[PDB]
Amino acid sequence: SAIERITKAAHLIDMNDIIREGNPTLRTVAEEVTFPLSDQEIILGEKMMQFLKHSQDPVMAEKMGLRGGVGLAAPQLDISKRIIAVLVPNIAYDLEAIMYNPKIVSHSVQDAALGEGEGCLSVDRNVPGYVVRHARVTVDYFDKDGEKHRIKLKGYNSIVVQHEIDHINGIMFYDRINEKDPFAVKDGLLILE
Ligand SMILES: CNC(=O)c1cccc(C)c1Nc1nc(N2CCN(c3ccccc3Cl)CC2)nc(N2CSC[C@H]2C(=O)NC)n1
Numbered sequence: 017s018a019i020e021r022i023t024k025a026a027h028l029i030d031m032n033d034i035i036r037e038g039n040p041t042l043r044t045v046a047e048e049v050t051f052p053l054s055d056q057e058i059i060l061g062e063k064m065m066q067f068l069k070h071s072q073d074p075v076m077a078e079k080m081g082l083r084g085g086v087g088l089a090a091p092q093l094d095i096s097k098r099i100i101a102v103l104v105p106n107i108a109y110d111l112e113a114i115m116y117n118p119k120i121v122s123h124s125v126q127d128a129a130l131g132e133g134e135g136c137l138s139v140d141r142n143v144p145g146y147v148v149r150h151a152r153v154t155v156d157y158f159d160k161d162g163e164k165h166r167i168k169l170k171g172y173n174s175i176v177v178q179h180e181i182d183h184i185n186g187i188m189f190y191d192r193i194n195e196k197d198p199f200a201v202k203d204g205l206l207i208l209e
Pocket residue numbers: 071072083084085086087105130132133134135136137142143175176179
């Protein structure tokens with residue numbers, strides 16, 4: 017299986033582990049993990065975070081042929097589990113978390129979108145447009161020990177976590193771009209830039 021292969025001590029996650037558009041797994045709803053976690057489920061989260069750190073290291077990214085990322089969801093590794101990793105550097109980190117069974121439990125009426133649009137590791141093309149998301153979210157998740165965390169996010173952090181949670185729900189960023197008018201600005205939409 018993908019999880020068995022990826023969680024080998026010797027394995028570093030790279031672009032060859034990341035599935036692309038068209039793979040049914042990206043459109044499937046991922047399964048909740050149960051507690052206690054298996055060693056493999058813990059290792060997977062750790063490997064995913066290591067991938068993000070490698071992708072953000074210019075030297076390592078070059079050596080490994082990585083595209084830079086600030087989030088990764090297990091379904092992108094062909095693993096249909098509700099596990100995501102997020103690593104947003106402060107422009108060392110604005111947000112660093114491995115989240116098991118993450119869930120948005122509250123959100124703002126206000127919407128937000130990145131002014132520069134969104135990119136995705138499983139998408140090898142540019143898809144222009146404002147990706148409309150909630151401006152602010154409250155997120156519950158469990159850590160590797162099964163301890164519950166409840167955090168509040170705004171700005172970039174909020175965008176990134178919503179993007180990754182979408183993956184575990186079979187949703188892609190362009191699903192949230194206005195079809196007819198990709199750069200439309202509705203009342204109540206904050207453009208982040
Ligand atoms: C089409 N417009 C654009 O690509 C886009 C264009 C400009 C600005 C933004 C902000 C854009 N948007 C966007 N840029 C990113 N990267 C900026 C570069 N950075 C990065 C790159 C290299 C090394 C280290 C790092 Cl840190 C990695 C992250 N990432 C995402 N997504 C959206 S949510 C999850 C996140 C993700 O990780 N995607 C793979 N969106």
